[PDB]
Amino acid sequence: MQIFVKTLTGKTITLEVEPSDTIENVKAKIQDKEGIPPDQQRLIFAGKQLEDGRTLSDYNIQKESTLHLVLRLRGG
């Protein structure tokens, strides 16, 4: 499943993922890819902050679903 993330700074990041993967996995796949830790990263889909425990499937995440990446600040 191709997914996109939009970073604060204007940088477009894409990752082929599975729908059964945890969101917490894809925060650590950014640490692999782009160097950013899980801890200070909060991810956004359809207005909602996406939370530990649950999966991209639960949050209905699909083919070219664009997500948003807040560094440190909660809110935005």
Give all strands (DSSP E) within the chain, no chain letters.
2-7, 12-16, 41-45, 48-49, 66-71
The tokens of 36 are what?
């950013």
Unique residue bearing structure tokens 């801890």? 39
The two beta strands, 66-71 and 2-7, are: parallel
Q: Which residues contact 40 (CB under 8 A, 6 or more apart)?
A: 71, 72
Q: Is residue 69 within 8 Å of residue 41, measured between CB atoms?
A: yes
The residues, any chain, with a CB within 8 Å of residue 14's CB and separated by 6 or more, are: 2, 3, 4, 5
Copy the structure tokens of residue 17: 């993922």
Catalogue the long-range contacts made by 11-18 (C-beta closer than 8 Å, 24 or more residues apart): 13/69, 17/56
SS3 27: helix
Q: Tell me, what CATH number does 3's domain have? A: 3.10.20.90
Looking at the 3D structure of the chain, how many domains does it have? Answer: 1
Residue 71 backbone phi and psi in degrees, to 5: -95, 115
**Domain carrying residue 74:** 1-76
